[PDB]
Amino acid sequence: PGIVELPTLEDLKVQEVKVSSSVLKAAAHHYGAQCDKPNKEFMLCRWEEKDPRRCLEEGKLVNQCALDFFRQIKRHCAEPFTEYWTCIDYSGLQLFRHCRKQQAKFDECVLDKLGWVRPDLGELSKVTKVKTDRPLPENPYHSRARPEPNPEAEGDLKPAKHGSRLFFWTM
Amino acid sequence: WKPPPWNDVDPPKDTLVSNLTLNFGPQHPAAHGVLRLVMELSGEMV
Amino acid sequence: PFFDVQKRLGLDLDRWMTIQSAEQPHKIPGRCHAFEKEWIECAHGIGGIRAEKECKIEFDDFVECLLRQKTMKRLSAIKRQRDKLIKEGKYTPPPHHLG
Amino acid sequence: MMSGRPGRVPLQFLPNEARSLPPPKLTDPRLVYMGFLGYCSGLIDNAIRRRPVVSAGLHRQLLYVTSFVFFGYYLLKRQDYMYALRDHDMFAYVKSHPEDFPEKDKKTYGEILEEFHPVR
Amino acid sequence: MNPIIYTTLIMTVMSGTMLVMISSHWLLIWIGFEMNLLAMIPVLMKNFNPRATEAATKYFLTQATASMMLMMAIIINLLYSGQWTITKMFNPVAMTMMTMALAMKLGLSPFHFWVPEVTQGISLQAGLLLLTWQKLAPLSVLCQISQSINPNLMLTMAMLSILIGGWGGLNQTQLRKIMAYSSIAHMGWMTAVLPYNTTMTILNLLIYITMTLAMFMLLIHSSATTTLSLSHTWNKMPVITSLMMVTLLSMGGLPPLSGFMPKWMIIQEMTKNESIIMPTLMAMTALLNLYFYMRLAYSSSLTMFPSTNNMKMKWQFEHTKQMKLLPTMIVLSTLVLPMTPALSSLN
Amino acid sequence: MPLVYMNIIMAFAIALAGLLMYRSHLMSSLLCLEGMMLSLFIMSTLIILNTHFTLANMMPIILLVFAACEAALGLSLLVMVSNTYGTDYVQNLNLLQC
Amino acid sequence: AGRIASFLKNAWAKEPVLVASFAIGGLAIILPSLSPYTNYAIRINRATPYNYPVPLRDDGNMPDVPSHPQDPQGPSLEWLKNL
Amino acid sequence: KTLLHKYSDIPEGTECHRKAYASTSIGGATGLIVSAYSIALKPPASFLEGVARTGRYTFTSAAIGAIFGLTSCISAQVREKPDDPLNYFIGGCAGGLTLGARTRSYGIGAAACAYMGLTAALVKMGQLEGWQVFAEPKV
Amino acid sequence: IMKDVPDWKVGESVFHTTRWVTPMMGELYGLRTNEEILSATYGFIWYT
Amino acid sequence: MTMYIAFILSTIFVIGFVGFSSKPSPIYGGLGLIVSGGVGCGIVLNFGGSFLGLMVFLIYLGGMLVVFGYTTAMATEMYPEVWVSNKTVFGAFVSGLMMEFCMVYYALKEEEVEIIFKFNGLGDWVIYDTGDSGFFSEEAMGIAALYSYGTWLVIVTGWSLLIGVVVIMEITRGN
Amino acid sequence: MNIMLTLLTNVTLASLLVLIAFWLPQLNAYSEKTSPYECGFDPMGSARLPFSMKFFLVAITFLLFDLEIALLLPLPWASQTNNLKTMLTMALFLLILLAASLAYEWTQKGLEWAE
């Protein structure tokens, strides 16, 4: 019933962010504010095209921006992040509650060195519009032709010819 | 065979009562050692 | 329904659950929402009799999505093949399937 | 058949397009028989309660006939409407589907050959 | 059963039944049945005699088991289809699995066993509720799923029901057992036409309902459950036994009475479907029904029967009871043949 | 269809065989009556978890709530089977044979 | 009036349990409507995002939704931060 | 359902060894069916006599099942008109006499050729014509 | 695997539809190490 | 091995299912059901239905508890049955345990099978799906929708229990 | 992994406890030692006859009560919905109905013991 199409090995090659859970969570807020343009276009393409195989390149773009965000966080505010992510890491649920002190140091560090703003609560969860230039998927579900409707009803109701027409009933 | 009762009530069955017979003693702590109480009780009421 | 009142008085009592492609709490999609989306709008108002022949090659694609009947047949055939040459010892799995 | 008819509204005694049909006459024989049926219920009711079967409870008899006539009249409106509806998609299908309905060039008996059975 | 609660005793039976017609979800159709089932038991024991508790229990195991099979037929269909809407089943065994269950709900196949048995212990009033109302719910499901029922399945089980149902009637002397076998045979009559056309099964259901309504009305009014006790009723009330005869003729289906139209219309529709041997077979077997109707009539009004002297005490008093609507059902279930075209209203 | 759906389906099969094929105890029969609920409950729970049918996840408990209702009234049929006949064995209740 | 008060007093003396249950049970039904925070409670539930706020394509004429999860335009919930 | 399908494909009379072998099977097969209810509704007393009830019922059903095949067999070839219901007229009801003989009653077997002789015939123009006892809902 | 098979087209979509489906985990971890699939399916559900 | 652990848990569900369906003494059947119920919790717990497993566990213990009370109340005999004592239940017992043995062998040996339905034995682990639940459990969140989406189900169910207490008093009234 | 390991470990330890309990202590059985205890004298002889307890009616109601405690258990997750107006009404319905079922169960005797 057809072929299966999947881009070859060389296509899905990219270095991945090799940082652990607690590192990502600690920088997640600033990561969301900074690298959202690659994020928004990637997942918009994911929901529109409804096929990763037609969205792998955008997957490459998001990793590179995740690299650059993490590359600059190492270059300037290396130490304060190290204290933050290791202190988050100790907690069994990575709760932000037990890290306000270290968060304060990290927040001001990126505020002055890399010039960043901590996203306010609820602000980052706002739905957003992305001005991607990708064409609209005409048939995302690969739907076929649909059956034509039944012959419609028209005309006017006239008295039944010879009434009931059942057995001897004349009317 | 036999026609069903015409008042539609079957003759009441003979008694099948099975009340417990219990000897509360002569060892029970509340029997105080030498009290042999044979009590006819159904369930938990005497 | 026999005597359709859900349509008549206009209040939903059981339609909300009748299908798995209907709206779900917090937009949790079903396993085969894509198939039930296509199947439902394929044979809608066309006719139950005029459904089993034309909305067919799309319907079994859904019925396969629920049960993976011939898909699991494929895995059984492949795994059956493994047993019949691994013992014969012609082939060895690549290190991707070991570590 | 027609519970699956397009536009069909369940739990609706008489739809709107039914009114375009000729309403049953008051003197319609089937309607007056339904009234006669209401009369027959009058005799029985007096009979079960062992009352004068012909002159007792004339008020009961009057209700026993009028109620049958009313439900009769509405029932015949529906009766005509369904038969008219069945005759409607009848002629809708014949016109929209000519090929499946052949009109054979039927020819008179002078050209046909029907065997004669000599009876005796 | 306390009068006020006796009302809601019956209310949930009706609404529990009403849930079956109005729902579009299989679980709701399932739910409507035990609500009917769980509330149907106590009224069967409203009199509360050892026979009543006997009659109720055989209903329970039979009905609970049938609903139990009803459940999987939903589940296998759900497993193989993934829909709860009341449409054709998409898996053949689930179809046959349901049709097997709904029959036990209905007393069509050898399952018909439980029908005469429970009718004896449960009172005449309870029987009036049982053979009439407790059949509407299974019929509604069958009409909805009529698209994908195996024709040789429904026909076979319908044929047997008129076979044993008519044949078992030619042994009984208690009117309730005779009545149940008559209902069993009529159970087969509607269900034979079920695959071909579902309008007729409603029509025969209606005629069956009003006639069985009017039938029990007379039995309560005569206050008899044995032919001999009924044989007495010629004395006290000859009108009751006089109409007892006429509706007994509608039993057999003898024209020009109403009872002919169900058999008439079904035979017509079946012959349109090129089944001629099958309608002919049930047509003959329906004579067995008519036979114990005639004997029941014979001991009722054609021939006078030995009465007593203390019954002339009864002449002084009368029925203080009524229940309205007996006069209507005698008329509706005896003189309605000139109104066959009204069946199209059901359509 | 996997063996899990298999072995559950076969489980209800001998539940029927246990149910209708009777014995000299009505209790043990109604024991099998609530028993076959297990298979249907477990069966049903398997699909809607497998199909991610979030809405139908309440159908098991709704099914299971009605489940013991049969048992509930079933036990009350037993007690006056005992109240009037003392015992439970299903042969003394035959007065309705007539 | 006097009968009603006496019946309450006779209740409160004969039984203190159901009257206490009936009282506090009765309140649990009424003040949920009169409470001025019930409209806030649904807002809190709505605010908590369990699924992703999936972005939507731009075609112009969409001032309400922001183009960046820091822009001033969009649904803001500083009410809940102070609340 | 294949057992009677494997009877129809065999022509009547010719290939009688196969035709009778089928006719034996469908006959006796119904015997276990009727005896199953007979044991079910009518309670037996022991396993020895329980299979005895199945014994006679399977003995008969196999017998009439067998003899119907062979008695209809002989008429089909010697008369050379298998498509004529007299083959099953004497072919069918002869078993009814043996059915009466199997119950030792030639009296009920006397009434057997009145009925089995009939119904056996009615199946033939069912074969030849388009008769269907279970008609598919065409309209 | 399917070189010596008499009839098995490599990479055949079991469904008629060409739209990609969420791949079935059974074939994802089909021939992987038995420990890996065991952790893959019953990992969370057993994790404690 | 634990790889077909669900294959195992499914089985002892039915051996216990067989044991109590062989109609032993009523309380012995009660034990036969609960072992199946307890292991039955395991199968659905394995698939992810944690809440469903706990509830079928919890209330069926409560359901079986009230059953035991009635069994010894007015449903027990002075000479109680056992799975071995009576030959009838012994025959029912032995028939049940070879019925599964011969079949699960056949299902596992051929892995294609025909009976009633077609069954690929392979492994129940296979049909699990590559899905993520986020910060919510589907098995618990869907049931929570009963009070926001299933108002009709709540009404019909809640109503039914109310008569459920009515019938449980109506039929027990004893005149 | 962990859960059945915990389950297996517990049944094993219990089995050893009863095993050394039932084997070690140098048994000596002489029939009357194994005779049933009847408070010093002989048993009348039964203990398997039907012990007709009088709380039968309260027994089944408990089953119905539990059936609806399972219904009202998803409340902690039900409170985290977007339609608390509907959820609050339907929730209070169950408790109102549960009280109503008990109230009828209470008022029409019911709860009272059978004597």
Helix-strand layout with pairing:
The structure is cut from a larger assembly and holds 11 protein chains of 11 kinds.
Chain C: H1 6-10, H2 15-18, H3 33-42, H4 59-67, H5 69-86
Chain D: H1 29-48, H2 58-96
Helix pairs in contact in D: 1-2
Chain H: H1 2-8, H2 16-41, H3 47-78, H4 86-102, H5 106-110, H6 112-128
Helix pairs in contact in H: 1-2, 2-3, 3-4, 4-6
PDB class: electron transport
Keywords: in-situ cryo-EM structure, mammalian, mitochondria, respiratory supercomplex, proton pumping, membrane protein, electron transport
Entry title: In-situ complex I with Q10 (State-gamma)
Task: Give a quick rundown of the structure.
With about 120 residues, chain D is mainly α. In chain D, about 50% of the residues lie in helices and about 0% in strands.
Q: What would the keywords be for this entry?
A:
part of a larger assembly, 11 chains, D: 120 residues, mainly alpha, 2 helices, flat, G: 83 residues, 55% helix
Largest contact between protein chains? F-J, 61 and 80 residues
N- to C-terminal separation of chain G?
44 Å
Would you count the extended β strands of chain G for me? Answer: 1
Instruction: Give the helix/strand class of chain G.
Output: mainly alpha
- H-E order of chain G: HHHEH
**Strand portion of chain I, in percent?**
under 5%
Radius of gyration of chain G: 25 Å
Strand content of chain G: under 5%
Distance between the termini of chain I: 38 Å
- Helix coverage percent of chain G: 55-70%
- Provide a count of the helices of chain G: 4
Helix content of chain I: 25-40%
Per DSSP E runs of 2 or more residues, the count of β-strands of chain I stands at 0
The shape of chain I, in one word, is flat
**3D shape of chain G:** rod-shaped
- Counting DSSP H or I runs of 4 or more residues, the number of helices of chain I is 2
The radius of gyration computed from the alpha-carbon positions of chain I, rounded to a whole number of angstroms, is 15 Å
- Which class best fits the helix and strand makeup of chain I? mainly alpha
Q: What multimeric state do the chains show? A: part of a larger assembly
